[PDB]
């Protein structure tokens, strides 16, 4: 009734800092490999196998039993929540009947040699939720997961790459995995998922191995992979994915239109007229021209492009990606102390015909900090100040719109101070505001919204 | 019956190249100032006044009498075609009753002190159309016009700047003009039109002068200007306009997103993942962060942006701007020769119950060149090659959608040759083509659309 | 140079009432057959042939020569303006090259046996305009036209029926026409155009005849018809069309949803709750049920539909249809008298630097009547009162948007009087308004818009 | 652990027929008054107070304790889920802070003086879900409910009337209600919710009582009502609501456009052209006319409308409303026996390592019937046969699309049979199909979708 995993979880509960929690969990996830080694040399470059030598490593995360109660007690739909898949004679085809996915239907598909894939494990299981909710804080990119249940003597899926950084957690059974290097430069760190491939289309595997429970297998986006079950045992695995559209390229995409517009507003060379007659030497039809105006034009394009770095709003865009990450974020999993010290742990309830324990209000004396570290971001838009937060997000991606509350200019400095000083308590009375009304109102607002905690329970 | 203008038109009819006709008329427009001096020093830099000392210079172009017949014989509409406005006691009013602009309404508005503005003189005047259609060819930019009639002792419009390069042709009467240099760096070569300014907002004119018929005033976008009729005499002028959104910045706007897209598809530095914690040091909150990872991130942006220049498809963007110019352009004005030697000049008509003078096909002995030099442009899009042309455009702006015909790859070299050797004749049989048929095919196709003239009439 | 057509138009210009003009021209159009006989017994009932015995009857209306000038001097396009079609071996081919329809393209198509179909003759021909604009006034419905030119020894089009009442006016040459009664009850007075039919689909013609210039052929919507040119001569005809979607059913479609909505607002029977269990006895599955609640339900539906007649806003729907007709209508063709006595005839012009002949205002002594009888209609919408008018419409269908001016409540009676008493003159001072100022101002507005004429010119 | 409510549910769980269950529960709901009396003279006419003399009638349904838990354990939002309302000094006020509804916020709004309205108790409560699911089966119309919780000495909501038939169940505390007869003819059986009224707009009540636990207070749409908590005690009630837009009027709205369309296709008088001159005597300007042609037009509009009943597709519209109802319907509550005899009862599951308890397929000897009576409906669209069902609906209104499966016509008569013949069993081998493959495939299909039960479990 215990695993390394239930222990690491019990551990996370005791570490006060969300930042520290995430770092710790990631260490665990890849142990004995050190994070720092992994991130500096292996991540995005190398396929990685961690032979755990433990069969009980991930016990308490997720299991086929979990799925079977899920099909029975939760409204799981084919195509929305669960897939049914078969690769045979170099040909894959989905077999989801439309509508609800009942055990009866599901298990019949298993018995016919269809794998089952559950698209949002974190919606229906609180242990996957917590796992992902913690790890996303150290990835600075949303982490989602798919759970893959493959029957004996069969392959579910075709060889292919994905558009995310993959962590395969083997959960039950065994599977033969083949992983390859990218076939060409343009497939390295591929931007979008590949078509399903055929076996002719592949080279040699860089890594071929039989995974077993507790084992972990990681490979960057672009690394083609397949996986089969061999001798009368099955596979269960959870693959954890992150880093979707989180490239330098995606950063520039957002920076550029702004930079050109800043440059055109602020500097008259970007507002000058094109030549009257550039059409006489620019264009496909003239790509071979030896007119020297051609090479002047090119050279001016190149410097003007270069000169836009100076006008790029790197900070504003970082904030905008921060805002999208908040929106993308799973809502936080509280420690017991965190809940107990917050609005969620106030003991006010309904007891025999009335509400009992109206709590204390917060005073200048109350000491406070941000509930956690990875749940809020302050962002300027149109000369206004908004705090976006994760605490009301659903455990389905984007099920809620992005949530935020205004921060008035007078309260700005205090908010920045709060965000920047987690996890160090601070007197409400000591927040850098003009009045005492402002100090209270800020903290009250933040406390009521489930963003703040007090050193000692209000009641 | 004769004027400097009617002589220069007659002269244009005898100059065989449309390139040369355009150069000549601009030379005429600014005479005696040299075009190369003007474009090298004054264009985009400085207001310019040309005291013609010839009050007949522009006769035949446009007169108030034309305006009057126009109101009576065409469907001229307030708002769409004609504004009537009054500047008094520092306010700008607009008095456009809705609907038709009859002579009776228009002339009473004028009698109450209203200035009348014709928005598209070139829709109702063949002499204005021809003027602009020739000039657009040596501007590389659409040339617009507006005609302004002001009654004695009034100002129609409040001071402002325009977003276009303006040439003011004083046609009747006299007007006192004031033109000011740009007030501040950001209004030099301004991007968009000004609001109505008050006289408290102005500095000192750089030029204040009373224009008389025949004179010319030019001032760049961003130069504020205002005008009034002074004692006992009205004014008519035509302002010729061009260079709307035709700047280096506009070219960059289109280039950038293509460039970033090509860099991501072609180079993995762009495909690399952002740091997992850039949010810790980047954002409005960290403007003044000493952290060594901010300056290293900023530095990388500046170098990646610089590297986009190597990826910029400059030629394809030039073709896209050329295609928009073809779409923006007035349909061409043919010389007597160009008409006679083209499809428009074919003698074929209906005569006494049937068609007669049914003409000869072209042969491989037929000698050809493009009908004019500013009527067509070859553009590549999505693997295919298209010839966009102006000969079916309307004298109303964008009343027609962009027009083209497909050029197959076999025919591309011949097409490129024809565009590039205007106005030298080429035997159809001497065209780069893989077959005689291919030779005939392209020539026939271009002749029928009115894109081609033969050395001798087909009939 | 004189023809029965040119005489009847010269006659129309001397008939002071537009109502009378419209009735006169229809009498002419079907002479010697009396209109009252035609509309009582033949209209919507029978195909009618009128052998004119006068090849000159229509001379002046439209000729193939007019088509030729129109291809050359107007921007006539294929598709938009002009179809080129061929019917052979039982198959309708359209051969419209895209773009301009120059004479050379069009006549070669005609020489390859294509007929040409001009879609909006009234846009390019003032005499067809006049013809249609006059006739619409006695149809109560838009009068459209197409011109069909067919070469010798060919058929342009497959047999078919159209959705309009058709009048075929043979202009040149000869054509062998066949017209068929409705093949079936459901095709009598058909609602929409037919597909192209083969000859296997056709019964026996009710009329088969060779038309010669001056003849007329009429047949109702749903009568199939086809036509070929036979021994070495061409044909040119003009088909006049009208009564598109102008039925009692069309009137009902609009009446019903207003009637139901008023019944529900004004009477509680319509508001009561359906029977809690009607689904047990009503539905396809209970077609042949015997439950006596099914037949009680059916009888309640029959009585409630019946009762909706009492709530039908018949007059309002009449006005909406009239407003649609105002929008649909061609702009009016003024007699010389009407032009002289209106705002269009006003002699104010620009002359040598100045307007001249500034004419008097209306006074309460001016006598006035509406410019014509079918240029305006007063329509109540949403508590306000609007006068919709046709004088600013274009000769292209719906090229302008419906046009009205607000008629304030105080002016209603005067407006109604004017509309209802054309063509009797009324002194402005005799109009039913509350003030003299109100009398002058209604009249001035109408006059200025071109809706009114004065017994004597204002100048 | 017992109440009249749990007994009637326990009673309900032994009644084999869903129809009978629904009838039974409604009887219990208004006990001791007979349904047959209520529906025949009370429903839609009268206010109705059922004094229960039994404070424990509804115990088990919903309590303020259930609310508290829900705030605490479910993601309940202000606006979407909960409302916080205060009626004071004659003004309604909404006091919802954006976002989540936590006990803290909720109970302080309670103690400030706000009522708390829960807009979808059936989403969070299984008992209320069962209640309504059962009742809707005997309303033929969606049953939905709101729970209102008002603190002592306040009023939450101003006087108003509603667009539904209301059943107020008093659950806790006591409220003094006032109900009113409709104020005027047009308010009787009102179509849309009234505005908030003042105590001026009101009349003198028709009913005025202090409600008490176990009581019920019914009244029809249009009936005004307000309700306060006087000295010393709170209120908790659940109002059940139905008959939103289920009127004769609404039936006719859907019937008519199709009636006219059918009439125009099937009968030529509905397709005959309007008079050419109706505009001369029809329209608001002629509402006074004495033209006898007008009275003929009116009389003709009237008969044509009355004639539309013959063409009304009454059955098709019944089926469409039936389809809308299946879409609006709560998913069913199975009995223990229904569960056991269906696909949901199958004992199939994931034992330690494998699936086990694979049920038997069905055979021609299996005895089948519809899972319940109010869960499916056969509808014809475009000669296609679709069986719309409710078994996958959510407990949130229209959260899902209308769900269905296609009945092929070989199965048609068999499907019809089952629907018509519940709750009595039928051999699969006796179903009216051509072949045995059809017999089986229909029953299988219906079984796996949760639509069909077997006499004995398949395992
Ligand atoms: O005519 C005036 O008073 C103002 N005219 C213009 O602004 C112009 O020609 O561009
Ligand atoms: O002229 C033809 O061959 C066909 N004519 C028509 O279809 C017509 O006038 O309605
Ligand atoms: O509970 C209240 O105060 C008011 N309730 C209602 O208006 C209702 O049930 O319809
Ligand atoms: Ni994968
Ligand atoms: Ni200007
Ligand atoms: Ni026809
Ligand atoms: Ni209510």
Numbering used by the authors:
A (entry chain D), B (entry chain B), C (entry chain A), D (entry chain C): 181 to 639
From the primary publication:
Nucleolar protein 66 (NO66) is a JmjC domain-containing protein which has been reported to be a histone demethylase and a ribosome protein 8 (Rpl8) hydroxylase. Evidence from a recent study indicated that NO66 hydroxylates ribosome protein 8 (Rpl8) and controls the biogenesis of the ribosome, which is consistent with the observation that NO66 is a constitutive nucleolar component. Moreover, previous work demonstrated that NO66 assembles as a tetramer and that the binding site of NO66 to osterix is located on the surface formed by a hinge region (interface I) from neighbouring subunits in the tetramer.
Our previous analyses demonstrated that NO66176–C exists as a tetramer in solution. We further compared the tetrameric structure of the NO66176–C–Ni2+ and NO66176–C–Rpl8204–224 complexes. When binding to substrate, the relative positions of each subunit in the NO66 tetramer shift. Oligomerization may facilitate the motion of each subunit in the NO66 tetramer and affect the catalytic activity.
